Write a protein that binds this ligand. Structure first.
Ligand SMILES: CCCCCCCCCCCCCCCCCC(=O)OC[C@H](COP(=O)([O-])OCC[N+](C)(C)C)OC(=O)CCCCCCCCCCCCCCCCC
Ligand SMILES: CCCCCCCCCCCCCCCCCC(=O)OC[C@H](COP(=O)(O)OCCN)OC(=O)CCCCCCCCCCCCCCCCC
Ligand code: SF4
Ligand code: SF4
Ligand code: SF4
Lengths: 115, 145, 176, 387, 155, 85, 114
């Protein structure tokens, strides 16, 4: 509840400041509106887009590597138990497996970034 | 009613569409109006100023063809699609209805061409999503004209 | 003669490549060299407060276009048209009607400080040194009108400071 | 389909001049770039035809503004060459001095602004302080800050003010220390290097066909110089040595600009040691105006003054092409003179106008983020390119 | 009486708004270098609060420096034309301020008035960085007397 | 829209000519010669035949297009250009 | 009289190429007038195009014709792309040219020997 009050405030001040920032410029002394805005023709900035697989793949590997990261995240709790052998075995095993994924993708044509 | 880029009339109708949807047409109809585009007016003034026999002669300007009913509102609202003031001073102002008296030198008596509403209306309106020219289906009220 | 760079043998021998893995890996050159040569910060910066202080200049500096006159002012300009004739921007105007005394001066002597490139040619060409580029740079008019000078404005510019210009000319006339 | 069409941007904070650009690309890679030049084109060459030699000279000052006394030297050498005159020795020496000083300017600018464009906000500041000292020299010399001519045909006029060469010496003393400070600021920086290493290389013969003349040919093989091979003035005598590079890598070109700054310090030094006290202008009264003391009190000096300003000296007809070494590379003017006062047709040669035409091939192999460095690396001013 | 509040607030939004005023540098030609020397350490801009940043949307005011050719002109007015409504134009250099050393031939536009309205004309070729700076300061002193709001109070 | 017919192609061509406003549909016959009868210009011809591509048509190059000059030539040219009966 | 003709030997192929060019324009008038968001109706724009062709209609020499065709495909080559802003494409139209009196006593009435 306490931190929820902090979230209620911190969401207010965001909202308030935003509102002030919208009022005052169109609450300003003189607001004048003329110029046309051409959405118009495709080559203004860039043109069109042939969205490329590289960036998307970066999102993907961000997923798989997340999953392995959070699967690894509880370890600081687990580093202390009555089975140490198994602990080391499967923690080194697990993040070693992460590094195996990375090593594979780094061996194939993936990444390499000039294309 | 003078019509143009930054003007206070048709732009106002474009901006009155907001909440409550009650600009006018309370009783409906009853409003005949003929907006005139601005450059025709100002050319009227400049010919009036540099042409003799424009002195001591009072006269008026006329929207050449349109002479629209309130169908204007839904037209200018139709084309350009869809995104401190005053009281019945203002809404009765815009609700004032007449073309008044025929005999007064209209336009050509001052020797200048007249502009129908359409094209210039597109120009000033702009807005919408801009990506399709389409048609826009001109109102063509011309009631009883 | 040719003395060329980057043609060298990088040593793949040991004790070079030691410091290469240290170099790539530990950023010592980057850190030490750069961060420190910026930590060179403490030297007193060079900045001058323009309202209250002004940078150096030279007796030959070129300001704005003051006309000059003799002691017991004669309107030193003879009207001889040279300053207009050599103007590389062509921006000058001279029209000279012989006045009451029979001596010749200019009716309208004009400049467009807009067009003016601030050569110095009109300062060299004047046989009597009537027009001289002022020391003062005093400007920033609010209208394109105000940058066009009558003979009158150029005179009043000359009256506003002369012993200034007299000091400069008296200094440098040995060079010209 | 794929590809794109992207466009320029109006300025980086230091931007000298504006180009547009159209690059047909692949995903974050540029297959075709087609720079649109001619954006800033003031039509000088048509103007020069309407103004006499003494008048048209500031055009040759400000067509390439950064390097200035060099362009001055180009046009002046052209009129002298075509006009059969030699300047007195001291004029030649002064002209050399400010020539290499100006070269120090355009190089320090090119390097620093090449940094500021890429990143690295500070070196621009450190060094352009010293550049301000340089203009502190010009202001004494010519009596104005930047565009002031101080160069004529038949030699320079208005020799140095008494006590100038002391200041010149003093700057030249520790400039070495400061440029070395830049060399620690860069050069083994993993960032700047690893950004520009192999980007935009060139084959020597290819550079010859594309006509690149400058730090291009220097840093890429093909050892060549106009300074060494075709000495155009006493600049022959003084000793110094030009750098080269074997990687053609655009990093070599950088380091070559640096070493040319250092060598410029050598040339400045030796020049300060060798200065003869002869005179300023030539002694021919009909080529160059007399000083005022002779002007007044003496008739023929007055006449040659008056006419030499109104009409200006007449140059015999002939077609010349002179070429000098300007900090952007080989610069030259092709003069065409009807026997007359005015010139007739003179087309300058902008090294940027050549080098710029090479982006098509040079940028073919690297994505746009380094097309930035590809443009900025070869010293270019879009005020000089257009003309 | 609220007019005291009026004038005071005027000196507030005005005081700040002028105290910063960080413009954009259009920088066509050799005036641009001199402008950079105004940005150099010696003459430094920052002392006066003017900040160096490039974008027409962030732009407080605009400095037209260099020669304005016919080909560039429309783009120039667009850069003017997406800008914070309060805005000011400072014409730098003999060229842009009415045509300078060209004023003739064809491609060059004569003055930047023919494109956008202008406030501070600073002559010089190039105007000495000190002179340009004096121009910016005088622009500030045009910002002082704006008295913009109390006429919105219509008295 | 079956395999096309004489009546079809004719109604189409005469139709698009009638939609074209610059020509006066007072007397327009299949035997008519444009610049002779209707007094058009070669430019007008080119624009027309362009409409003959954009509606129906689509195949026309220039060297064929220049010599049409009469609507029946449009008929037969498009006909044999596509399907025999 | 010798010559080095360019793309065509006789006025025939000239007329051919100009027919081609006018085809291109009549293709791309709508795409441009929609592309830069002009206020002109496609009909009007096309009419100005064919006008600009008709202005030069009196030429004979097919060298000249061919060169003019190079001009045309050049400018059209610039409008097919975005390299030319709304400005110039409008600049073909003259809105801001004041109407020039072409009748005598009006010209005499003002211009004093234009
Ligand atoms: C690269 C970052 C390293 C960070 C530190 C971690 C160090 C160890 C990193 C892994 C070694 C990388 C060596 C390079 C070659 C890797 C090729 C590869 O993994 O291909 C997938 C290999 C394919 O092997 P393969 O027999 O098909 O041959 C290689 C074929 N290529 C390279 C084309 C794919 O797949 C496997 O190894 C099968 C699944 C293994 C599951 C995990 C076992 C972990 C060990 C248990 C004991
Ligand atoms: C005895 C028991 C076992 C003990 C084992 C101990 C083993 C220790 C071995 C060394 C440990 C690691 C040392 C640090 C490694 C960090 C990562 C690294 O090496 O980065 C280097 C990398 C190289 O760049 P590059 O050559 O382009 O890439 C090669 C790719 N083929 O990237 C770079 O060089 C570029 C990175 C530049 C980053 C921007 C500049 C940063 C400047 C400030 C950095 C310093 C900040 C210090 C911290 C501040 C206070 C917290
Ligand atoms: S300094 Fe100015 S007035 Fe004098 S010659 Fe040059 S442009 Fe003309
Ligand atoms: S050169 Fe001197 S004296 Fe002659 S007209 Fe000009 S200012 Fe006057
Ligand atoms: S006024 Fe002078 S310094 Fe400025 S852009 Fe023009 S020529 Fe260059």
């Amino acid at each position: 509840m306490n931190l929820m009050i902090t979230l209620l405030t911190n969401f207010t001040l965001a909202t308030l400041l935003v509102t002030i920032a919208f009022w005052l410029p169109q609450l300003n002394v003189y607001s004048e509106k003329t110029s046309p805005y051409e959405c118009g023709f495709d080559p203004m900035g860039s043109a069109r887009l042939p969205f490329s697989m590289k960036f998307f793949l970066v999102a993907i590997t961000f997923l798989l590597f997340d999953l392995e990261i959070a699967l690894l995240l509880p370890l600081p709790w687990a580093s202390q138990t009555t089975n140490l052998n198994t602990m080391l075995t499967m923690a080194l095993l697990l993040i070693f497996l992460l590094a195996v994924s990375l090593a594979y993708e780094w061996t194939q044509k993936g990444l390499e970034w000039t294309e | 009613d003078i019509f143009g880029r930054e003007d206070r009339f048709l732009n106002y109708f474009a901006n009155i569409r907001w909440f409550g949807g009650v600009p006018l047409i309370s009783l409906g109809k009853k409003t005949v109006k003929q907006p005139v585009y601005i450059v025709d007016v100002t050319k009227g003034i400049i010919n009036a100023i540099k042409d003799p026999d424009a002195r001591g002669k009072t006269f008026a300007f006329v929207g050449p063809n349109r002479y629209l009913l309130f169908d204007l509102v839904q037209y200018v609202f139709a084309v350009a699609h869809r995104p401190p003031w005053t009281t019945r001073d203002k809404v009765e102002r815009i609700h004032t209805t007449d073309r008044t008296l025929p005999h007064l030198p209209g336009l050509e008596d001052l020797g200048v061409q007249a502009t129908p509403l359409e094209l210039k209306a597109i120009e000033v309106l702009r807005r919408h999503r801009t990506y399709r020219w389409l048609s826009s289906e001109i109102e063509d009220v011309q009631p009883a004209k | 003669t040719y003395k060329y760079v980057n043609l060298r043998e990088p040593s793949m021998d040991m004790k070079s490549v030691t410091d290469r893995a240290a170099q790539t890996l530990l950023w010592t050159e980057l850190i030490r060299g750069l961060g420190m040569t910026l930590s060179y910060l403490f030297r007193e910066p060079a900045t001058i407060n323009y309202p209250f202080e002004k940078g150096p200049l030279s007796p030959r500096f070129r300001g704005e276009h003051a006309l000059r006159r003799y002691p017991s002012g004669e309107e030193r300009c003879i009207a001889c048209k040279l300053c207009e004739a050599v103007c590389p921007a062509q921006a000058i105007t001279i029209e000279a009607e012989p006045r009451a005394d029979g001596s010749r001066r200019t009716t309208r002597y004009d400049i467009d400080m807009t067009k003016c490139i601030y050569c110095g040619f009109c300062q060299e060409a004047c046989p009597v040194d009537a027009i001289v580029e002022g020391p003062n740079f005093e400007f920033s008019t609010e209208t394109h009108e105000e940058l066009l000078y009558n003979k009158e404005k150029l005179l009043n510019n000359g009256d506003k400071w002369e012993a200034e210009i007299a000091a400069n000319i008296q200094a440098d006339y040995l060079y010209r | 389909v794929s590809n794109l069409t992207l466009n320029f941007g109006p300025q980086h904070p230091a931007a000298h001049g504006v180009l547009r650009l159209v690059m047909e690309l692949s995903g974050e890679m540029v297959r075709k770039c087609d720079p649109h030049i001619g954006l800033l084109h003031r039509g000088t060459e048509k103007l020069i035809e309407y103004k006499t030699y003494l008048q048209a000279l500031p055009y040759f000052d400000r067509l390439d503004y950064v390097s200035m006394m060099c362009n001055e030297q180009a046009y002046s050498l052209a009129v002298e060459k075509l006009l059969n005159i030699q300047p007195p020795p001291r004029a030649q020496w002064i002209r050399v001095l400010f020539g290499e000083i100006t070269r120090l300017l355009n190089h320090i600018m090119a390097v620093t602004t090449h940094a500021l464009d890429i990143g690295a906000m500070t070196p621009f500041f450190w060094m352009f302080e010293e550049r301000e000292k340089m203009f502190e020299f010009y202001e004494r010399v010519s009596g104005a800050r930047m565009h002031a001519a101080y160069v004529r045909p038949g030699g320079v006029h208005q020799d140095l003010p008494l006590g100038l060469m002391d200041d010149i010496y003093e700057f030249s003393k520790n400039f070495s220390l400061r440029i070395d400070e830049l060399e620690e600021m860069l050069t083994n920086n993993r960032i700047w290097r690893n950004r520009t290493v192999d980007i935009g290389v060139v084959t020597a013969e290819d550079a010859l066909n594309y006509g690149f003349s400058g730090v291009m040919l220097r840093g890429s093989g093909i050892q060549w110089d106009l300074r060494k091979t075709q000495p155009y003035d006493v600049y022959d005598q003084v000793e110094f040595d030009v750098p080269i590079g074997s990687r053609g890598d655009c990093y070599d070109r950088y380091l070559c600009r640096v070493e040319e700054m250092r060598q410029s310090i050598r040339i400045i030094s030796q020049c300060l040691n060798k200065m003869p006290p002869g005179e300023i202008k030539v002694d021919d009264a009909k080529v160059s105006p007399p000083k005022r003391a002779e002007m007044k009190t003496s008739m023929e000096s007055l006449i040659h003054h008056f006419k030499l300003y109104t009409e200006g000296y007449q140059v015999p007809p002939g077609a010349t092409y002179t070429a000098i070494e300007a900090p952007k590379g080989e610069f030259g003017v092709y003069l065409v003179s009807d026997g007359s006062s005015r010139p007739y047709r003179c087309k300058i040669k902008a090294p940027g106008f050549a080098h710029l035409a090479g982006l098509d091939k040079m940028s073919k192999g690297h994505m746009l983020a380094d097309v930035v460095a590809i443009i900025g690396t070869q010293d270019i001013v879009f005020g000089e390119v257009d003309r | 009486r609220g007019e005291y509040v009026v004038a005071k607030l005027d000196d507030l939004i005005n005081w700040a708004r002028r105290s910063s005023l960080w413009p954009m540098t259009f920088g066509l030609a050799c005036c641009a270098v001199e402008m950079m020397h105004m940005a150099a350490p010696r003459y430094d801009m920052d002392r006066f609060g003017v900040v160096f940043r490039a974008s027409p949307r962030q732009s407080d005011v605009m400095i037209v420096a260099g020669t304005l050719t016919n080909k560039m002109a429309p783009a120039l007015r667009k850069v003017y034309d997406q800008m914070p409504e309060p805005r000011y134009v400072v014409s730098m250099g003999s060229c842009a301020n009415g045509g300078g050393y060209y004023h003739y031939s064809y491609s060059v536009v004569r003055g930047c008035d023919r494109i956008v309205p202008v406030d501070i004309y600073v002559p010089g070729c190039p105007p000495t960085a000190e002179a340009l700076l004096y121009g910016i300061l005088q622009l500030q002193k045009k910002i002082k007397r704006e008295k913009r709001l109390r006429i919105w109070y219509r008295r | 829209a079956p395999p096309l017919t004489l009546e079809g192609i004719k109604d189409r061509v005469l139709y698009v000519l009638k939609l074209y406003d610059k020509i006066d549909p007072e007397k327009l016959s299949v035997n008519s010669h444009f610049m002779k009868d209707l007094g058009l210009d070669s430019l007008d011809q080119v624009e027309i035949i362009m409409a003959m591509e954009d509606e129906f048509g689509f195949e026309i190059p220039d060297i064929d297009a220049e010599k049409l000059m009469c609507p029946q030539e449009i008929v037969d040219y498009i006909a044999d250009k596509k399907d025999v009966y | 009289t010798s010559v080095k003709p360019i793309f065509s030997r006789d006025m025939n192929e000239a007329k051919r190429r100009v027919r081609e060019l006018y085809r291109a324009w009549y293709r791309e008038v709508p795409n441009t007038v929609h592309l830069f968001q002009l206020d002109i109706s496609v009909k009007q724009g096309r009419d100005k195009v064919r006008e600009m062709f008709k202005k030069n209609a009196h030429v004979t020499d097919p060298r000249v014709v061919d060169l003019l065709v190079i001009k045309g495909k050049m400018e059209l080559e610039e409008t097919i792309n975005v390299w030319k802003q709304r400005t110039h494409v409008m600049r073909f139209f003259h809105e801001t040219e004041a109407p020039r009196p072409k009748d005598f006593l009006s010209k005499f009435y003002v211009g004093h020997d234009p």
